[PDB]
């Protein structure tokens, strides 16, 4: 039932732009917050981006490595979450995962982990 | 095991599904018995055994008074 399917990856020249899109199906997309986490080939997990629920301002929080270059967004009308990667470097070659942040309760702006 | 719960904001209520029933539908009666004894020179021990027999006889006498009023609700 619960599924997150990311799409839009592939080959891209250094310095251009590519938009990843995560399609959510199985739960309420507007009530939950989404996150983007990548893993470089051979390297560990690196937390990249995070967008909060519509109820909590739609606040985009990025990491230092991609701040100013990446842009997270969401389209609640169609249950989808985007990660716009601009000014891409060669270090950005990685596997990009889409996750859902789990609030400390049913609904809270404090998150304990990445559920899905 | 494998318990769920749902909250409905429209009605301000919550349902906890996933339990198993164990309803008490009827009764079963059992009779428990305690066979008694028909009991109608002071050394060291006899005083204690005598007052213990007094405890026994007073217990059976009190139970004779208690069964006097058959229970009823």
């Amino acid at each position: 039932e619960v599924q997150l399917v990311e799409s839009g990856g592939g080959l891209v020249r250094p310095g251009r732009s590519l938009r990843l899109s995560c399609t959510v199906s199985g739960f309420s997309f507007d009530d939950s917050a989404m996150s983007w986490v990548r893993q470089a080939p051979g390297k560990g997990l690196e937390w990249i981006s995070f967008i909060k629920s519509k109820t909590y301002g739609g606040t985009k929080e990025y990491a230092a490595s991609v701040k100013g270059r990446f842009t997270i967004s969401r389209d609640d009308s169609k249950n989808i979450a985007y990660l716009q990667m601009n000014s891409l470097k060669t270090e950005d070659t990685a596997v990009y995962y889409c996750t859902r942040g789990a609030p400390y309760g049913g609904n809270s702006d404090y998150y304990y982990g990445l559920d899905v | 095991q494998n318990i769920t719960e749902e909250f409905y904001q429209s009605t301000c209520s919550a349902v906890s599904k996933g339990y198993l029933s164990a309803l008490r539908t009827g009764w079963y009666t059992s009779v428990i018995t305690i066979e008694l004894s028909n009991i109608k020179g002071t050394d060291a021990k006899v005083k204690l055994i005598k007052q213990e027999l007094d405890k026994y006889k007073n217990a059976v006498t009190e139970l004779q008074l208690l069964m006097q009023s058959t229970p009823a609700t």
């Binding site: - | 909250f7 009605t11 055994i49 026994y56 229970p71 609700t73």
Partner: protein
Amino acid sequence: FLGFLLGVGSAIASGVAVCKVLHLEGEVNKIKSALLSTNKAVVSLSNGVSVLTFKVLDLKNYIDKQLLPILSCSISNIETVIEFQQKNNRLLEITREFSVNAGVTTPVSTYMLTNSELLSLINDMPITNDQKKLMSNNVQIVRQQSYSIMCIIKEEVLAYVVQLPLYGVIDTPCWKLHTSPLCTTNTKEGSNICLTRTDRGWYCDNAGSVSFFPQAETCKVQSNRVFCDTMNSLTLPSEVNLCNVDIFNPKYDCKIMTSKTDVSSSVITSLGAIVSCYGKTKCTASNKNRGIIKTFSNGCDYVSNKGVDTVSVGNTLYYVNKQEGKSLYVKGEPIINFYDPLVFPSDEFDASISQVNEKINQSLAFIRKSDELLSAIGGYIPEAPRDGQAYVRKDGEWVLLSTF
């Protein structure tokens, strides 16, 4: 909540019936002759009903054999004194429990029936292996659902009835419904209207219908098993479950309770907590390590126990149950916003969704029809002056026939 809708029953009626049967002549001798050899037997009474019989204590074969020959007399050993005390203490404690509870005690104490004796009785009861297993694993619950009626003490034998429970319904799906007031969130005092679902309690599927227990405090819960009592129940149709997914369903009229008392409260559920935060009251949900993780807005909201340890409403601190399970939040418009506060019945206890809507239909009649009769006060005409000639109606007065 709906405990007044329940019937009135006699709990010990069956055991007392067997008791009155045991008063009959010869009835006690049948038992004494049946247990003359073994300690446990099955005996069919005069009326044909078969009951289990057990001899737990034999002071006869102790006082008459081990104690009588010594009684001029002298005791030689002290061990026999303590032995007699150990043998007699059970009868003493049983006498105490009966003399306090007027002959009927509940729960059944260990003095009245030890665990060994209780498990033996369950092993020989005419029920299924599943029922024996259930009663054997939860002897604490069997003790709490059983009575001990003292019957008779005739012919050098003592007799009391142990009324044991029969679990005729096992392993069917159950669910517990929790409710809380759902009020508006206006700023003016007493201007708010409140509505509360009253159908809260335990529900269990049984024989194509639902057994409803309005006083969930009387249902005992162990593991995922729910030991309820049909005596404190209501036999409802299955469509009652619709009230959870669609309170405005036509097939069942869901019960509510209306008021204007907007006070803040919280209902701790199995996997979370419902919080009704109204007025200037401060309601929060906190975790034992970081602290406050949510400050509730005015209204009725929910918080799962996944990562939350306490929930505080006003000056009251609740600890949520730390049971493992999945909690799902179902969005929805609070139905109290669908109502007009000017025609809302604020004095309704034993109410329902349709009963309140029909009480609204009447008020809509009373105001839109009858009160609008005020419009017919100034909209009609007074008598013209009873003078010589005739008057015509011009402007808002009677202005004669100059105009002619």
